Short mmCIF file of C-alpha atoms in Angstrom, two decimals:
data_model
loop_
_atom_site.label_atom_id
_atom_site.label_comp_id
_atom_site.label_asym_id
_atom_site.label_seq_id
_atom_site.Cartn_x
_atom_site.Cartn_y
_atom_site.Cartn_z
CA UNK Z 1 -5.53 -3.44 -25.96
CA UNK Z 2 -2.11 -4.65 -24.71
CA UNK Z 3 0.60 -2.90 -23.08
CA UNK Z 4 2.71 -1.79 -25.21
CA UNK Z 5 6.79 -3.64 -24.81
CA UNK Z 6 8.57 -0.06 -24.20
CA UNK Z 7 6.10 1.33 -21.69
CA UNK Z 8 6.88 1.42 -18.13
CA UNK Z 9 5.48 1.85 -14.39
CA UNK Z 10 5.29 5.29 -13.88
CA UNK Z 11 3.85 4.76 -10.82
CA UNK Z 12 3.07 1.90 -8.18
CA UNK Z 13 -0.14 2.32 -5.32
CA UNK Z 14 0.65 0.83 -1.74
CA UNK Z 15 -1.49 -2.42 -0.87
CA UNK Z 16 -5.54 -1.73 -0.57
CA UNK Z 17 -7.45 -3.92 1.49
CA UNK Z 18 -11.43 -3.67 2.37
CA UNK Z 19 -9.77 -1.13 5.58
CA UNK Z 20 -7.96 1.42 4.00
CA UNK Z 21 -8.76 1.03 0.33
CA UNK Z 22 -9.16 5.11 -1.43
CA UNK Z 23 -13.39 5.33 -2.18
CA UNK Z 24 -12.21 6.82 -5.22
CA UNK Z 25 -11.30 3.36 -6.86
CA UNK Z 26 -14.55 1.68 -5.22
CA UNK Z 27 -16.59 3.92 -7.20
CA UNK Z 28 -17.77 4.47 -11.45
CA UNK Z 29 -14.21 6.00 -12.65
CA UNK Z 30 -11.86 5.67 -15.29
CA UNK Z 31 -8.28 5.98 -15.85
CA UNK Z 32 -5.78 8.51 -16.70
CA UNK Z 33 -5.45 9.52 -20.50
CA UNK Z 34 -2.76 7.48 -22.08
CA UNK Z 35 -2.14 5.04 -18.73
CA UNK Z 36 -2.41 1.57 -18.38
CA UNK Z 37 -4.13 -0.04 -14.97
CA UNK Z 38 -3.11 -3.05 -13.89
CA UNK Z 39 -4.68 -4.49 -10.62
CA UNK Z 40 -2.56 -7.20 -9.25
CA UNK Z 41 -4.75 -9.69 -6.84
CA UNK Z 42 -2.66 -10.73 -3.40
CA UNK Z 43 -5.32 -12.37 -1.89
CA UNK Z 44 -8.94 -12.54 -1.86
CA UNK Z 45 -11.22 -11.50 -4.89
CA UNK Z 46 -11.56 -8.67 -7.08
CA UNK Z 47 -14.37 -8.18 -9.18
CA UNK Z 48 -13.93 -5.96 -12.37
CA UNK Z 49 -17.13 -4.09 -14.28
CA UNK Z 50 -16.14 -2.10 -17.31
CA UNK Z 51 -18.46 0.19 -18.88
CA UNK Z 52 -18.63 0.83 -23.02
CA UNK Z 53 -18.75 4.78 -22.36
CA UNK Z 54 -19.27 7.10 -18.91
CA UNK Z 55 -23.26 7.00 -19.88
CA UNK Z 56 -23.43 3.40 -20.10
CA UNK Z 57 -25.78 1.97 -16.92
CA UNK Z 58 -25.07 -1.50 -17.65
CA UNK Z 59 -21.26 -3.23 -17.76
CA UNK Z 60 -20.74 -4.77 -20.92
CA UNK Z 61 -17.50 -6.67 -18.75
CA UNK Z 62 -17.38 -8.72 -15.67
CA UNK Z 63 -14.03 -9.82 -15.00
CA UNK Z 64 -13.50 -12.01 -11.25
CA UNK Z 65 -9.53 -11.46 -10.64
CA UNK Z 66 -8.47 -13.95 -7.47
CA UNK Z 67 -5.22 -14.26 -5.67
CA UNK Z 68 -1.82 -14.57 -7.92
CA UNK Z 69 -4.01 -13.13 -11.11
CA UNK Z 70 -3.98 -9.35 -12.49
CA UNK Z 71 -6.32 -7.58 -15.18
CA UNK Z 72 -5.56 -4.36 -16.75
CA UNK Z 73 -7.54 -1.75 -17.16
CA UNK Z 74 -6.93 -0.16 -20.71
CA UNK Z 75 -6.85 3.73 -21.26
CA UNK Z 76 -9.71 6.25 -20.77
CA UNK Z 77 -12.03 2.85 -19.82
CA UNK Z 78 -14.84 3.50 -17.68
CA UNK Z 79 -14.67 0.91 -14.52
CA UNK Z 80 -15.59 0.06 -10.80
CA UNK Z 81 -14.57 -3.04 -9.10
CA UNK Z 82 -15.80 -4.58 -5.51
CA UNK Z 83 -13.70 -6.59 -3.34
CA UNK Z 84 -14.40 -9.55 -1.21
CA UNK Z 85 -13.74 -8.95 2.79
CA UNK Z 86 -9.83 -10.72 2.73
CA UNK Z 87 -9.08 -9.04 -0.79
CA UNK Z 88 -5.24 -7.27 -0.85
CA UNK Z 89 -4.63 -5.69 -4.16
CA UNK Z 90 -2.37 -2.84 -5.91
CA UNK Z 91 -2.29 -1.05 -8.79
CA UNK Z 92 0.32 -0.57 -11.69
CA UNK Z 93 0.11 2.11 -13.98
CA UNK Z 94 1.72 2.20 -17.15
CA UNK Z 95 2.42 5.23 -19.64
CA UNK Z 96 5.27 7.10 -21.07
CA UNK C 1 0.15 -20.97 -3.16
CA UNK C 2 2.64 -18.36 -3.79
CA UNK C 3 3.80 -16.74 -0.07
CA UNK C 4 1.58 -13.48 0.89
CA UNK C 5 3.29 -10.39 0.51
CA UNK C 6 2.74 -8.27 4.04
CA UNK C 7 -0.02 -5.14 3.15
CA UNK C 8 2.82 -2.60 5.11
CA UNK C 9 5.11 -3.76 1.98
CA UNK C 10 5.92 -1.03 -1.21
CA UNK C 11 6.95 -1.44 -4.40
CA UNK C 12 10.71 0.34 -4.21
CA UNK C 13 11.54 -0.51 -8.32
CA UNK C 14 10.15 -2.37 -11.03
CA UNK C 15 11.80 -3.51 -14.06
CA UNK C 16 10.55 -2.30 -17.75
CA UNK C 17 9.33 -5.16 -19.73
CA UNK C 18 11.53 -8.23 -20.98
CA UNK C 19 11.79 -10.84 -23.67
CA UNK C 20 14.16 -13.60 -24.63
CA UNK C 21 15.37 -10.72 -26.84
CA UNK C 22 16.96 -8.40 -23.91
CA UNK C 23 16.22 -9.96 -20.72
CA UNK C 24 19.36 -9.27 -18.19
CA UNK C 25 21.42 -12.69 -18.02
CA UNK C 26 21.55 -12.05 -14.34
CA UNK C 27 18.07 -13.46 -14.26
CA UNK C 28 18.46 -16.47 -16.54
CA UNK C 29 21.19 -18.04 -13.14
CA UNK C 30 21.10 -18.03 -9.70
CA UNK C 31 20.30 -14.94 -8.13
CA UNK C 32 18.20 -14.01 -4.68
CA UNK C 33 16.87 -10.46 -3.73
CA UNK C 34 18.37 -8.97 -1.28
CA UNK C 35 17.45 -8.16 2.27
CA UNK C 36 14.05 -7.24 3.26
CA UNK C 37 13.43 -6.99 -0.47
CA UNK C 38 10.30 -9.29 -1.63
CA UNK C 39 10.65 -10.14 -5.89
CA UNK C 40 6.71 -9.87 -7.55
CA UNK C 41 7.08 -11.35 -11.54
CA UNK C 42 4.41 -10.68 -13.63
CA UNK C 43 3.91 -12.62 -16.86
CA UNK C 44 2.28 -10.28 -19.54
CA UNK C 45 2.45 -12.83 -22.07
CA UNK C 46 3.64 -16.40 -22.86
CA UNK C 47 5.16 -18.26 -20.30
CA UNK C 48 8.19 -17.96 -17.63
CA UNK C 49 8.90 -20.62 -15.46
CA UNK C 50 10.46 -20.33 -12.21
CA UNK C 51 13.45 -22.82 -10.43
CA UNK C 52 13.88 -21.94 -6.47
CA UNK C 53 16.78 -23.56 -4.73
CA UNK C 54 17.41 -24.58 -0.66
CA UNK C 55 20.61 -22.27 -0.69
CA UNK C 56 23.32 -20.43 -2.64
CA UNK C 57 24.67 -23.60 -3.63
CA UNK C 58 21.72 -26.19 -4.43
CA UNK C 59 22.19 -27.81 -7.61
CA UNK C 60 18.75 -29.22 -8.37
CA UNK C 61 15.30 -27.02 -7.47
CA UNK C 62 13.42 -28.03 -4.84
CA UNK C 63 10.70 -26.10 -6.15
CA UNK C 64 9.49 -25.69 -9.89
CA UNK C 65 6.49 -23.19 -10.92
CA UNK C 66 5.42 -22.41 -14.36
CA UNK C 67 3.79 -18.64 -14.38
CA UNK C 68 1.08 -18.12 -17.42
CA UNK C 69 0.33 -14.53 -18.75
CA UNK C 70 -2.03 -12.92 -16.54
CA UNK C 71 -0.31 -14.64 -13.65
CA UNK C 72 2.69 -13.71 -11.27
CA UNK C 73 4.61 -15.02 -8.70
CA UNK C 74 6.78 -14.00 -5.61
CA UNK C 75 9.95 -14.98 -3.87
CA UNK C 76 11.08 -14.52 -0.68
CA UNK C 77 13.83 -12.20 0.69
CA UNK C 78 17.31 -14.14 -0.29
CA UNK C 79 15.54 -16.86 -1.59
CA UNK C 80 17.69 -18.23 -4.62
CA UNK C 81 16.14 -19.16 -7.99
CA UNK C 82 16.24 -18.41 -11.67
CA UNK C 83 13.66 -18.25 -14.09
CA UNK C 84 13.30 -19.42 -18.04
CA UNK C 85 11.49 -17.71 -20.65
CA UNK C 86 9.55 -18.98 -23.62
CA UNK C 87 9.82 -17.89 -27.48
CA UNK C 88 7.21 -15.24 -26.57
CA UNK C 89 7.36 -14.85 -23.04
CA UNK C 90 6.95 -11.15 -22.22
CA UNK C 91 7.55 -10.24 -18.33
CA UNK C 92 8.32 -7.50 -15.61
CA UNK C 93 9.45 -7.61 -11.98
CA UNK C 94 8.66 -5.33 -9.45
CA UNK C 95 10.62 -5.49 -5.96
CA UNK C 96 8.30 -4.97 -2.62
CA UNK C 97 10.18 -3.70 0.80
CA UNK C 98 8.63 -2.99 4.04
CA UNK C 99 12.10 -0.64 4.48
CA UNK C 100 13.08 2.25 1.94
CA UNK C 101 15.49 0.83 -0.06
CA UNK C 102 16.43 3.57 -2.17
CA UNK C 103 19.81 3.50 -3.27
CA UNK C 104 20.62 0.19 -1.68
CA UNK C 105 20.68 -3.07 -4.06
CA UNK C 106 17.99 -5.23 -5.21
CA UNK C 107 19.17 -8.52 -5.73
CA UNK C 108 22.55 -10.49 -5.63
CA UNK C 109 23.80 -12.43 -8.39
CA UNK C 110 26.36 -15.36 -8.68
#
């Protein structure tokens, strides 16, 4: 899936580091219903696992986003992702 | 090396998506962002490429960077450049401030 040309940011999250990044994104989730998730990579590394499903024990993605690079996260997907010590990242989410 | 954004920063606006089809011609000259105001432009497909200049009045770029989809790239606070899209370039900025800049303007033009 690709974002679609007349969606927009709906909303933006501040900067997350390894210090003060929300547990919640650190852990098996997924996104909102009908939202895009992009992760934009500042600096240091940020390692993407999607999951096929919520049951799923094994990711059937491994995606390694470094500094300057961004991956997004399609609708409804099932993900986690693990940062390296000196990773800075954000997330954009698209809908509307 | 694109320049580090601060971690204190926040996104204040961000532009909806553009093409060579309606991307504001403000973009396509010289133009900075204002104060305190960091640019972010993310390339969602094809390819932009990105002219920075010394000053307001530099005629050739003293810096050239071609940005791929799944790539962006920042600029400085009044640092003046332009950028040039490709047939199929599709692309978005989003504007960073450590200072709420509601109201107040983004970038400067001209």
């Amino acid at each position: 899936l690709r974002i679609p040309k007349n969606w927009t940011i709906q909303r933006s999250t501040p900067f997350f580091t390894k210090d003060n990044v929300p547990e919640a994104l650190l852990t098996h989730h997924n996104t909102a219903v009908d939202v895009f998730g992009q992760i934009c990579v500042m600096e240091g590394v940020v390692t993407y696992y999607g999951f096929a499903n919520s049951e799923a024990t094994e990711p059937e993605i491994k995606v390694v986003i470094n500094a300057g690079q961004f991956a997004t996260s399609p609708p409804q997907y099932w993900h986690r992702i693990e940062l390296s010590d000196d990773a800075q990242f954000n997330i954009n989410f698209w809908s509307d």
